[PDB]
Design a protein around this ligand. Structure first.
Ligand SMILES: [Zn+2]
Length: 252
C-alpha cells in the first residue's frame, strides 16, 4: 500500500468508527512485524475514539489516553462490518485483530503476510520513533515552495533521491516522483540546490496534483515512446537504485 491507498482506507474507515465506543478487542495474533500489546482489550474497552487521521503510511486512531497506530505494510487491509448489513463472516487464518464496538460495528484487520503493525502509544505523535524523522505531508499547506527551497539548499543529490526521501516529504514513491518531475519539467538529474523558488513552487503543486488524482480511485514505463508535450524520445535510466523516465528535451 502506497500513500493514496492508506488515505482512501482512512476516508473509508473514519465515518464508521469516529465517535463510537470500543466494547471489546479480540486478538487472534500478537506478533506481526512488531509485537502487539497483549492487553489491548482492557486498554481500549469503554473509551470512545476521539478522532482518526493519517501520517505517511500510518493510520492513527486518537483516543483520550493515547493513539493506536496501524501499518498495513505490504498486504494489510481493514474492513468494517455494520450490524445493519449482512452477516459477519467467520474469521480467517489471516484475520488477526477484531475491534468490536457497542454500536455493533466491527473493524477487522487482515494481513495474510503478517507484515503490518498494531502499536499503542501513550504520548506525543510528534516524537514517535516511526514518525519523527518524517517531512511534511503532501496535501498539506506545510508543503510550500519556501520549505522545499530551504530543504534543497543543503544537499544536492539528484532531484529524485530527495523527492523519494521520506524525511524531505512523505509518500511520493517511484511512480509519483517520475510523473511529477516530468509534469513540472525539472529533470531527475538536476542538482537539488540549483533549482529556485519559481520551480519549487510548481513542483510542489504538480506533486500535490499527481497525488490528489492518485487518490481519486500514465504519461512512467513510456521509454522509447514520444513525449506528450515535446514529443521527445524519453529515456529510461536506473540511477537512484530505481527506474527513471524523463524527456531529455524538456526537463533541463
Ligand atoms: Zn518532452
Amino acid at each position: 500500500p502506497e500513500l493514496p491507498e492508506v488515505e482512501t482506507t482512512l476516508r473509508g474507515i473514519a465515518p464508521h468508527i469516529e465517535g463510537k465506543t470500543v466494547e471489546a478487542v479480540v486478538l487472534r495474533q500478537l506478533k506481526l512485524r512488531w509485537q502487539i500489546n497483549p492487553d489491548l482489550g482492557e486498554i481500549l474497552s469503554g473509551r470512545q475514539v476521539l478522532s482518526c487521521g493519517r501520517r505517511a503510511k500510518y493510520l492513527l486512531i486518537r483516543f483520550q489516553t493515547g493513539v493506536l497506530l496501524i501499518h498495513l505494510g505490504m498486504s494489510g487491509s481493514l474492513r468494517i462490518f455494520t450490524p445493519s448489513d449482512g452477516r459477519i463472516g467467520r474469521p480467517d487464518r489471516h484475520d488477526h485483530v477484531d475491534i468490536v464496538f457497542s454500536d455493533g460495528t466491527v473493524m477487522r484487520y487482515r494481513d495474510p503476510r503478517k507484515f503490518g503493525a498494531i502499536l499503542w502509544y501513550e504520548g506525543i505523535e510528534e516524537h514517535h520513533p516511526l514518525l519523527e524523522k518524517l517531512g511534511p505531508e503532501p496535501l498539506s499547506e506545510a508543503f510550500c515552495a519556501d520549505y522545499l527551497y530551504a530543504r534543497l539548499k543543503a544537499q544536492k543529490r539528484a532531484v529524485k533521491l530527495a523527492l523519494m526521501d521520506n524525511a524531505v516529504v512523505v509518500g511520493v514513491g517511484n511512480i509519483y516522483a517520475n510523473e511529477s518531475l516530468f509534469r513540472a519539467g525539472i529533470s531527475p538529474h538536476r542538482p537539488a540546490n540549483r533549482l529556485k523558488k519559481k520551480e519549487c513552487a510548481l513542483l510542489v503543486e504538480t506533486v500535490k496534483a499527481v497525488l490528489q488524482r492518485a487518490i481519486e480511485t500514465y504519461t512512467y514505463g513510456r521509454h522509447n515512446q514520444p513525449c506528450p508535450r515535446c514529443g521527445g524520445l524519453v529515456v529510461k535510466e536506473t540511477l537512484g537504485q530505481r527506474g527513471t523516465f524523463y524527456c531529455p528535451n524538456c526537463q533541463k
